[PDB]
Every structure is written in C-alpha cells, then in structure tokens.
Amino acid sequence: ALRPELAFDHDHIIRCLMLAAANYPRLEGIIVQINTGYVASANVIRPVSEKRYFPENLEQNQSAARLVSAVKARASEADISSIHLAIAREVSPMFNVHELKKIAESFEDPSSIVVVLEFILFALFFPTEFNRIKGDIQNVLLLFFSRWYPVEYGIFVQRGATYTINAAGEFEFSGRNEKWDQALYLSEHFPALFSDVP
Amino acid sequence: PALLRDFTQVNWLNRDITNMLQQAGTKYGLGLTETRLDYVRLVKTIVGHALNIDHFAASVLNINLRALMEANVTADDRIKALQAHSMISTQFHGPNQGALRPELAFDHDHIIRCLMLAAANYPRLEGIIVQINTGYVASANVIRPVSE
Amino acid sequence: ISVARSMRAIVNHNEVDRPRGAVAPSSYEMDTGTLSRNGDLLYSPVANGQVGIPKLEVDHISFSNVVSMMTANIRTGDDMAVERVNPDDVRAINIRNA
Amino acid sequence: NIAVAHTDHLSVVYATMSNFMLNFTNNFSGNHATFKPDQYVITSPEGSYKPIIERQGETVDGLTIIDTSIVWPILCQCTYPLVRIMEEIVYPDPSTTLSQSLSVAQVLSKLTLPDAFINMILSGGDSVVMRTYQTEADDDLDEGIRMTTYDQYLSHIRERLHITNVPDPIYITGASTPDQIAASVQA
Amino acid sequence: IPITNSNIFDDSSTPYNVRIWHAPTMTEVNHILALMRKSTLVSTHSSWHWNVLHTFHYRSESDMIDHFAAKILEDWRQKEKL
Amino acid sequence: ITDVDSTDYGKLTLRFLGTLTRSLKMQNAQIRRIRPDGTVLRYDDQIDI
Amino acid sequence: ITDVDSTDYGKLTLRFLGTLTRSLKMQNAQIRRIRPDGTVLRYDDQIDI
Amino acid sequence: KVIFNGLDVNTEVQP
Amino acid sequence: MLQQPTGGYTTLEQFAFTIRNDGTNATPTQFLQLLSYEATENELVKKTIPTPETHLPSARNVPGNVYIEDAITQALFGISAQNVNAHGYFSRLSALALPNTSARLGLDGVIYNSETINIPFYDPAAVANFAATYAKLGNASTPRYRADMIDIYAHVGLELAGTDAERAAGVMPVKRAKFDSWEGSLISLSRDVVNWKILAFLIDLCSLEGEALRAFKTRNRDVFRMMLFIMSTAVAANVVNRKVTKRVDRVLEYIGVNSMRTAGRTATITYDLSRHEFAAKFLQLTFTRWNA
C-alpha cells in the first residue's frame, strides 16, 4: 500500500548524523534522551524507598562498622533519572569518550573488596559502558592487586600494563608499567588486565 | 607611516614611502599573522598579531609569553603543590584542563635564594613560618587542652 | 640635536618636488618583519636564502612588530577546581617507605 | 532475587533499543580483549579534521563521567515488574520513540544544512581552475596544453580517483613516452 | 636498608646505609648514577649483589673515608693475588 | 533565516574549559576511517559502509 | 616609587618582620657555607645546591 | 550518597 | 611535495643554516673558525654508543597537527623550554614511520595528519627513513629507553673540539672553548640555531646513502658542530668572559663534559633534567646515524 512520501534516505541520514556527531555536542544527549524516555516508558525498573544494602543485624553490628561505612560510601541513593540513564547509555552512541568517576581507594581494609564488586556488577549489568571505562577501572584494580596479590602483581605488570594487537591478531604486551588514560581509549593500546591471556 | 601610503596628500612622502615599501628588504603588515591550534581541542591558542608597536615592547611581551608557553606546565601541575600541603596520601582528582591552561613552573632557585636572603636580613621570618605551621597543627585538631 | 627625528616637513612645496630638508621615515619603522621560532623579532630578509636581521641586533627603531598573544581559549592564572579525597583511616597512612 | 527482572525482561528492552533508528554506532563486540570502536573523521584536503569520537573530558551535558556506584541502587533498592506478585508488563507504543527519532533526524538535517551549504560553496564545487598554454600559432584559446595546479588536483580530482579504485596517475619526468601516458590515462 | 655493625655489642650509630634501587636495565642504572651526582655523600661498588643496583649513603665524610679505605685495602689485597 | 536553533553547533562545551568554538569550515570534506595514530585511511568498501 | 599594597596577609608579614633596616651589604653577595671554625667555604658541587 | 556523573570538586587551587 | 635533490634537502637555499655574526649571516663553519681551545690535563675517551632501541613509541591518537620542528629545536636550543617530555609529542614522528601513511611532514616542521593544500612537505619516503629513527625521541624519558647523559658528551667534544688526529685516536684532552665575543653571544647563537630548519638536516641524514650521504656528512659537518656547540654550552660547567686588551673572549669549560647543571644562568640556555634526557637521546640517535 503506497505511502505518498519520500523514502527514508539511509545514506544521507547516516552522513548527516556523522556530520552532527563531529560538530554538534548536544547530539549525544539528544539520542540518549530518546533511549532514556523509552526505558522510562517500559516501566522496567523503579526505585523503591527502603534500602536493602545489608543483611539483618549486620548494620547495627559494632564489628561490622568499617564494612558498613565502606558500603555506605559506595551506595548512592536511587533516582529514576540516573538509573534510566545508566541503562540507556549502554545503547546510546558515544562521541565524547567516557571517563570513570574516579575512586581513591588504598585497599587496606578487606571491605575494600566492595569497590571491586562495584566494578564487577558494572561489568555485568553494563558490559558496553564498562568496556569504555575499563582501563580507567584497571588503574584502580592495579592498586587492588598490588596490595592484595603483590607477587602475581609483580609478574603481571612485568609482562606489561598494556598490549596491542598485531595484524596477525596476537597480543603484544608493552612490558612497561604505566597508568592508563582515556587518551588511550582511541589508541592502539588495550589495558592488559582484560586480555584474558593466561 | 607605512599606513600613510596613498593617503598622505604630501606627494614626496607618498613617493618615498611607496619606494621603501616596494623594496624587497621591507614589508609592512598589520596582522593577524600566525594562529596556533591545540593538539587535542583543535581550537586556536596563541595567535601572532603584527601590531603597530616599538620592537622593544614587542620583544619583552614575546619573552613573557615565550616563558609562559615553553614551560609546559599546566594548572594540573598545581596538584603537586597541594599534595605537599595535604595530609600524606590525600588524592587529588581532575579536571585535566591540559594545554589550554598554561602556567609558569614554580621557580625553585629564585625562591630558595630569596628565602636565604630574607632569613639573613629578617630573622623574624622564623616566626612567620612557625606561625603557619602552628595554624596547621591547630587546624589538624591533633591535640586539645582539657579541664581534667 | 635632532636625534629623535623620524620625519620632517610633511608639506608640499609649489615650486619643487620635495622641500629641502624634508625627511622620510626609515624603512625599518615599516618592516613588520616576522616572529622567529625563538620569539625574537626579525626584519624581513634583504634577499632570498638569508635569515632576517634581528631587530634587537641593530640600532634602528621599528614600529611594526609581531607580538604573539593568547586568545580567549588559553587562560592563565585562573583558580582551578579539584576533588580532594582524604585518607580513609589515619592509622593506615604510610609515613615511611622510600 | 532480581536476576529474572534483568535477564527475562530488561534484556528485551535492550534488544529493542538496539534496533532504534538513532542508535547507529556499534558500541561493543562483547570481547573486552579485542574490541575497539570504529573511528571516523570528517576530513578535507583543505585541512579540516573533525573526529566523530574524541576525548574532550567532562562536558556540560553530564554524560561523560560514569558513577559506577549506580549498580548498588539497581541491586539493592529497585523494584521490578517481575519482582514482584503479578504486575502487567508494559509494551510501549513504537510510535512515540519512532516519531521522535524521525523528528530528530529532520532537525539534524535542517541544522547541518546551512554548514553543508556554505561549505559546498566555499569548496568551489565540482570544477577546477585550468590554464591552457598554447603550443602552436593559430591556436584557439580552447586549444593548447591543459594544466592545473596541484592544489586543485588535491581538492577535486584526487579523492575521486581514490574512490573509483584506480591507480594514482603517473608522474611525468623528461623521459616519458606518449605510450606510457596513454597507459596511465586508460588505467 | 640500615647496616648494623658486624660486632653486635657495638650498639652505636651506623656509618652509612645501603639503598637498593629499582634498576634493572643498564639504562636505568646509568640514570640513577647520574642522579646520585646531585645527592651528597653517596658511593657505589663497581658491581652489585643480586644484580641489583645499590648505593651507600654516609652520615659524614669521615664514615665515607673509613669505608673507602677498608675497600681500597680489600681491592689492593685482591689485586695482589690476581 | 530557516528557524534552526544552531546554538552550540561547532563548539566544545567543556565543564572547566568553558565553551570553545572550532572552525565550521570543511569544504570538500569526506567521512573517513582513521588509523589509531590519528592519520586518515583511504576509503575501503570492504570495511567502510 | 614601586611600592604596591600587598594582600592583607602580606601586610601582616611585613608588619611582623619589623623595620626594614637592611644593614647587610648586598653588593656581589653570594650564599656560601661557613665552617663552624668561621671560615667561608668555596661553593662545592657534591654538597651545596 | 547521591549519584553524580561528574567530577565532584571541593578544593580550589590558587595559581 | 618538495622532491629531495640528489644531494640533501640541505643543498636547497631554502634551508641555509646561518648564525648572525659581525653584522652578517655567517655560515656556521666560519663561526667555528673563531673557536679556539685550551687543553686541560683531563681526558675524554669515546666509548661505543649503545644501539638505539628498536621500539618506536606509539603515536597517540592526536587530532591536531603537531609542530615537531619547534618542539625539537626548543628542547635542544630553546632559552625557556622546560618539561619537554611531559607533553610527549615527539612520539608523533612515529606516525610518519608507516609505509603509505596519510601523514605529511611539512617544510613548516608541522606533522599534518593528512596531506593538505598549499602546504609544501618532504617526500614521504625520506621522512619515513627519518622517523624510523627519530620517533625514538618519543621515548627519551621512559626509563627503559633513557640514553646515557654522561658518556655521550665525549663524542660531542670529539666532533667539536677534536683535531683530526684526536678524532682518529678516539681520545682527546678535555678542552676549553673560547672565541672573541659580542654581548649576549651564546644566547644569540642559540636563538639563531633554534630558528634553523634542522628537520632538513636530519631527514637528509637518515634518507641519504652512499656517496650522497658521505658528501652530506662533509658538507654539513659544521652545521652539526654548531648544534653540538649550543648543546655543549647548555651543559658547560661554567661560561666565563676574559678581558683581552679591549676585547672580550667568551670561554666555556668544558667541551665534552656534561656537568648535569640544571640551575639557570644568564649566559646560556639551560637543560632541566628532562632537557638532558632529551639531548642525550638525540645525541645517541644522531651520532648513531652519523657513523656508518
């Protein structure tokens, strides 16, 4: 059944989206908003009022206090907007490279494992957004390893904190310990923690 | 006077100025002459204008700016000073303004000289420094007087 | 006495081409030259294959120069925002190791 | 407790959203070890270089920085339609997100049009300045040896040759036979 | 690392201390040796145990003199039998 | 004239650096993949659309 | 001629430093270690900065 | 506490 | 593109290297004639220069056109350059190292990511030969690749102060350079050199081979020696003037000995530690290419 209108011009539209992506900073947000609204319309997730951060008794437990402070330091309050955004940006195109909201953490206390879990969950719930911020995550994880697993750490970092991939497809580790920066996300380099090379 | 050309109603002057400006050895210009964009932001940073100004002032001004640019010290380097005045292992994050916010490197040599000299001329300098330290200890809340 | 005198007698004469004693400005006042990579001002080369004479090398005065300057994009001396993050526990701080 | 809400519900919202009109990029291959985003620039022989993806740091938009802490409320303070006991699932009308995708597209084409138009003009379009020095007497102005500056060739001819998958045209030294030029031209 | 006196009844201030360095390439060693010219009372052996660069840092010039002497004697006595 | 809200077009809107305008000039520009070095690659039908 | 009023903390410091008598003869002055014996040592690389 | 996608500054360094 | 002649790019008048001197544009060679030497008891013995690392630092994904010539010259010769390895743009030379790259090294000394109109540039092959070595300036500060900043200066002295016999011997007395001088001579020499289009020199040094390279090495020895002179003054332990009957003889002691000084002085340019690391690396690479 004929619709008396012009055909959707795939080619022209993609070219213009590229041009806008290269020239119009607001573009990212625009697309994200669409996605956000969609999540909001799907009614998939809402913030309940009561928190369930801790097992029964543990919050009032006096020997749990450092742990409870750690979790509470990590656990931000639920908001529909930040959450819908977190879901939506998994699908939304990225034009400005994302950065991790930096965490200072020495990893002395066992409770510091919370931060590690915070990443793992983020890598499960949001593999894409994770893959974007993951070298910046490696900077934190390297502290975690050097503190918790010093000898494995020395070995790993002796192999190199980053690697590249030759035309053959084999990984080539730097052999050098160096802090990752998102300047690198657009480069040939990968953070080495995620190589999954034994 | 280069601007006078074909505007001065004085004939010989316009002829002489035209003749000089037509020599290979001299060329008037009223800049902008040289843009320099940033390597990341891709926006202009340091432009060179051909101002009407005596070459002495131009030289001093260019020396000043040369110093500021060639130091390769951004505002981010200020973090290093802050760390010195912070409790050990404070962390300092962001915002990575980069090349767009240059500053001069802290001048170790001149300061240590001026300090030695000051300490020689003004022994009371001791009490200034101590006072700074005192305030810090007081701010650190490490110890308080008590009635008990 | 007239050591400061760049110009003189900016007037036409009716009988003659230029008035006697009329003085044109020196070419040096009008060579904008260039800014060298060092930041020193230079006169234009007298000929091809030659670098320009630095303006500060000779005794002539020059009134067109290339002053480098920063645009609105570069800014210096502004105060800078930062997120300080204090140590989690004072007792865990390491004063010592080299 | 919440895992069913994720796998057996939210997954479909992702699968739909990935098919939305403006979600045009390939964000992630599922392999952290190897994946890199495809990188593009709008680029001109005249010297423009506008990367599509670039790292400018924190922006006014508030999208660039990621608080990962968001995972906590998602685990420990969100309800879902699947958890719990029955709540009707919502299947959103396609028309709203579709029509806003479309209105965004037209808003973009309208927005980039003035730049696309001025630049079409500033480029000088699909033609080149060309001198024609005459090799003989009684030569018409049209007749002679056609020649153009390298800058024109770069702006206008070269990318087209690149795009048509043909070998780059031969240089002509003082020892160039007409047959070589012929082979080049036919190539 | 502090060095105790070999006699263990001599509990008194130790003349110097060793300082193990990160090294491990020769280039890193050259760099640290160049940077130690900047520091004050510092010395090295021609080669290092564990193949790990280490330097001596002296409380005073006299301590450096006593150490340098004991070493000149050990090398004279070694060269004598080489 | 065509009633477009062209605000912030051609501009980086940074939180700490402020707004910064880039040149809107791009005569004869093409979309092209770049090598991670930043340098442009010739168009390839094999990978590029 | 060239005095300029300082930030208020600086005025407090100059006030604290007392009168600027400056009896010291600063002509060609250098910074050098003295021996406790009282002799002025020549500048020495490997000890002075 | 609250979620905030942004650098959460508090100090200001003087030049 | 400017095609490289059968000789170097340096044969072209466009890249004359000259220092201003006695009111004229003197060739560097005729400045070095003014130089004279006073041997001390101490000796320089030249050691083998370690082979430069095979590793070219990865060019970072940089959107902009880096001004490489300016960075290099200011690092080696600049009056006010500091922290030359923090910005880390020398790695960018590696972008030119690839066969069939879109990048061009302009005569401007800029590194365009793409060929762009009305900007003349060096032939990409020659630039590739050049970058294949000089990109390693990009790892002048990384600890594994740092050059010796002490021993290498012997070669500097040998190529500067060294008589042909002393150069054949490989050892020379530590000399002390001197020349009749105008006020602020070394600063002006250093600025006259920072303006040099040295990329022509390095490109020709890396691209040429056989008789062309050898003829280059003789025709341009004094250019190289001038760069060595500026550099050496940057590392000379002290730089005095001497009265000599209504004339002033500038004197730098000593040639071929890096004093590692980082404190600034009016007399000459100063190397911060980073500038030392850079000059050391530069001399390693350049002396490696100079001998073959």
Short description:
It is classed as virus. The entry lists the keywords viral ATPase, histidine-mediated guanylyl transfer, conformational changes, regulation of transcription, virus. Chain E is of the alpha+beta class.
Tell me the layout of helices and strands.
This is part of a larger assembly, with seven copies of chain A, one copy of chain E (82 residues) and one copy of chain I (292 residues).
Chain A: H1 10-23, H2 26-42, E1 46-47, H3 65-74, H4 80-88, E2 99-100, H5 113-125, H6 127-148, H7 150-159, E3 162-165, E4 171-173, E5 190-191
Antiparallel strand pairs in A: 3-4, 3-5
Chain E: E1 16-20, H1 26-36, E2 42-43, E3 54-58, H2 61-81
Antiparallel strand pairs in E: 1-3, 2-3
Chain I: E1 19-21, E2 24-26, H1 28-32, E3 36-37, E4 43-45, E5 66-67, H2 68-77, E6 104-105, E7 110-112, H3 124-134, H4 152-160, H5 164-169, E8 171-173, E9 177-180, H6 185-194, H7 198-207, H8 211-219, H9 221-235, E10 238-243, E11 248-253, H10 273-290
Antiparallel strand pairs in I: 1-2, 3-9, 4-8, 5-7, 6-7, 9-11, 10-11
Helix pairs in contact in I: 2-6, 3-7, 4-9, 4-10, 6-9
Folded structure, characterized:
The PDB classes it as virus. The entry lists the keywords viral ATPase, histidine-mediated guanylyl transfer, conformational changes, regulation of transcription, virus. Atomic model of cytoplasmic polyhedrosis virus with GTP. Chains A and 6 copies are Capsid protein VP1. Chain A starts with 9 loop residues before the first helix and ends in a 7-residue tail after the last strand. A three-stranded antiparallel sheet of chain A has the order 4-3-5. Helices cover 48% and strands 7% of the residues of chain A. Chain A is flat. Chain A is built from seven helices and five strands; from the N terminus they run ααβααβαααβββ. By secondary structure, chain E is of the alpha+beta class. Chain E is 39% helix and 15% strand. A three-stranded antiparallel sheet of chain E has the order 1-3-2. Chain E is globular. Chain I has ten helices and eleven strands. Chain I has helices at residues 28-32, 68-77, 124-134, 152-160, 164-169, 185-194, 198-207, 211-219, 221-235, 273-290, and strands at residues 19-21, 24-26, 36-37, 43-45, 66-67, 104-105, 110-112, 171-173, 177-180, 238-243, 248-253. In chain I, the strands form four sheets. Chain I has a four-stranded antiparallel sheet, with no helix packed on it. A three-stranded antiparallel sheet of chain I has the order 5-7-6. Chain I starts with 18 loop residues before the first strand and ends with a helix. At the A-D interface, helix 1, helix 2, strand 1, helix 4 and strand 2 of A face helix 1, strand 1, strand 3, helix 2 and strand 4 of D. Strand 4 (80-85) of chain C pairs antiparallel with strand 1 of chain H.
